[PDB]
């Protein structure tokens, strides 16, 4: 099991540099669409031999036709060729409503025009050099179609795979009572994972997928269930706020200890 | 639901929401207000601009007038302040242009490295942003004092409008007409 971390920008670099000096970081997951004009050698210098993986935040590919994506695919594919990521991955997310840009990525309506969404998945993934993995959303509200049934169709009808976020699935269980159980059929064909912390919304109305706290015990016990169910090739221990090296290192330690 | 989505872009409806739905829509809306407030300390000179209800009024106005709420949000906010107040300090205008240039470097997903922004109120100032070009280097938000675009902005930009250009890099001034 290669245990890694996410890297989206420069705010966290002091903290990552400290992690590099006090822990084994087996790989780094770049939020690659934040590095599209970055000198590739400068990226390699920072990685200092560590392998990388790609995670795409803002392709917004469900809002676009295939032709609008060509330019972004070209840049990403050059970065894929030069950096050779272990995997590449994107999100199932909603970024606009009635033409207004949202301040956050919201959950997709899985059952609405499911076939058109599967077609956009095929189109985007066919333009990227490699098998595209799609990450499960930390559901806040229930809807008619299960996220599981949605991903079952992705995995059956397209060339895409699953990037399974363990704490996102835990968040959905709390928020919408989606039994974690339902993912285990798909989990068994997944080898690349995420795990992170979260926070309570005001008045504890739902869990927010902040990547800002340490991983809590129920999520680690979910991790061990995942480890029993499948082969964990890689897991990225995510952090996007509160760049305290001791807390991130504690998360990395707990993830490794839990599967030993 | 589409009602939850509707209240995120059009918050001033009185259509009822449950507590969970209301806290979510408020949370999502709070994120864009925090971005503005954290990046523009000069707004504290006018505390009325800083209330969450003022933010909600701003977002609602953006819905009715289809103003952009992406990286151009800060520019939209300046236009709302102009629309509502008789005057706004140039330091608020400047900080909001700086915020927009910053947000451009995070949102634009092309090989172009540079955005340049100007406003009719500051015809002798050119604002810009450069994406990070090296792994450990921050994005660069800059300001130029120059008359280079002043003739173009008085002849081709109506008062109250911003104009912006996307450029491959920051070596040359914009030659063309930009947007707005």
């Amino acid at each position: 099991m290669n245990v890694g971390v996410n890297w989206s920008g420069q705010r966290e670099l002091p903290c990552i540099n400290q992690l590099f000096l006090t822990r084994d970081i087996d790989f780094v997951e770049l939020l690659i669409d934040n590095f599209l004009t970055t000198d590739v050698d400068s990226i390699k210098a920072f990685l200092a031999g560590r392998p990388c993986a790609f995670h795409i935040m803002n392709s917004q590919f469900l809002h676009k036709d295939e032709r609008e994506l060509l330019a972004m695919a070209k840049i990403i594919n050059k970065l894929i060729h030069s950096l050779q990521p272990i995997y590449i991955s994107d999100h199932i997310g909603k970024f606009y409503h009635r033409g207004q840009a949202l301040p956050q990525m919201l959950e997709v309506d899985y059952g609405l025009q499911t076939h058109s969404t599967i077609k956009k998945v095929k189109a985007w993934s066919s333009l990227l050099d490699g098998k595209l993995l799609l990450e499960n959303y930390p559901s806040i509200f229930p809807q008619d179609m299960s996220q599981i049934d949605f991903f079952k169709r992705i995995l059956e009808e397209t060339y895409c795979g699953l990037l399974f976020d363990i704490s996102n699935a835990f968040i959905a269980e709390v928020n919408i009572k989606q039994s974690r159980t339902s993912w285990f059929d798909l989990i068994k064909h997944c080898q690349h994972f995420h795990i992170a912390g979260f926070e309570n919304a005001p008045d504890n109305q739902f869990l927010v997928d902040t990547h800002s706290q340490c991983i809590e015990e129920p999520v680690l016990s979910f991790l061990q269930e995942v480890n029993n169910a499948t082969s964990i090739a890689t897991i990225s221990v995510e952090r996007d706020e509160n760049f305290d090296v001791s807390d991130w290192a504690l998360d990395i330690d707990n993830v490794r200890n839990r599967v030993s | 639901m589409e009602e939850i989505l509707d209240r995120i872009i059009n918050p001033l409806s009185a259509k009822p929401l449950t507590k969970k739905e209301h806290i979510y829509t408020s949370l999502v809306l709070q994120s864009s207000q925090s971005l503005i407030l954290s990046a523009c300390p000069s707004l504290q000179s006018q505390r009325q601009f800083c209330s969450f209800e003022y933010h909600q009024q701003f977002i609602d106005w953006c819905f009715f007038n289809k103003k952009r709420t992406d990286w151009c949000l800060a520019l939209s906010f300046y236009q709302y302040l102009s629309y509502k107040n008789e005057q706004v300090s140039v330091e608020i205008l400047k900080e909001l242009i700086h915020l927009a240039c910053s947000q451009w470097t995070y949102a634009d997903k092309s090989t172009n490295q540079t955005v340049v922004i100007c406003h009719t109120r500051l015809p002798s100032m050119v604002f810009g942003g450069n994406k990070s070009l090296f792994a450990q280097e921050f994005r660069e938000v800059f300001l130029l004092e120059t008359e280079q675009l002043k003739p173009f902005i008085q002849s081709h930009v109506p008062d109250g409008y911003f104009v912006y250009w996307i450029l491959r890099d920051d070596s040359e001034y914009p030659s063309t007409m930009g947007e707005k």
Partner: peptide, 22 residues
């Protein structure tokens, strides 16, 4: 640009991240 008389300014914001706001 050619009036290289420029000032770089700080902006207290943040890149796109997967972490939701709270």
């Amino acid at each position: 640009m050619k009036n290289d008389k420029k000032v770089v300014v700080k902006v207290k914001d943040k890149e796109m991240t997967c972490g939701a706001f709270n």
